[PDB]
Amino acid sequence: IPEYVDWRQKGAVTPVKNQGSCGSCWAFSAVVTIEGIIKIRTGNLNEYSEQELLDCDRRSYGCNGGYPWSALQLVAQYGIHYRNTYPYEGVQRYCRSREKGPYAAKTDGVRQVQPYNEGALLYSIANQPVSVVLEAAGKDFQLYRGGIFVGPCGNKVDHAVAAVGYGPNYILIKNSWGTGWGENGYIRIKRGTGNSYGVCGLYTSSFYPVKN
């Protein structure tokens, strides 16, 4: 794999979103990976519905949090609508997939990156955007305004984001806190520290959708 990967430059990343007060990072995270892989396979960059996952993933807890892997499993089993058809409301409501006609896209499955393995994550990011988790509760992460972020942070992972690239010393992360946060909504997190947890626990739990 190359020394630099940046899916934004391959047109596989949609504009940065703001999840708002709702604890929907898990759905925003999953949608990035769906947006990326559908671009990769079909050549079309579309936006898909975080709100659909928020409302319809019964294994997750809506705005109280959830699981990127189950959201990704939901898209593999059923599918997902365009963000336009099913826009973000920032609150969990009932699942309205049926009232919005045919799914716009469907994946074929979900895989886990082997955890606590930096090479395995980079290998996956070289193929497509990956859903990853990290500890975002610390003030240093929250007040991040740019640069390669080294912490401080623990591994009490609490926030699902999406890795859409990497470099020699960092993994490039799309956050869902709007374009005002970080680097136009992104964060470069240090890699290659030998911490098998990853900085801020970045290697704890990573998933990506499969699209044949």
Ligand SMILES: *[C@@H](C(=O)O)[C@H](O)C(=O)N[C@@H](CC(C)C)C(N)=O
């Ligand atoms: C993240 C967010 O929206 O800031 C959520 O709070 C969330 O889904 N958390 C989730 C754990 C991560 C997937 C690691 C949970 N169940 O706490």
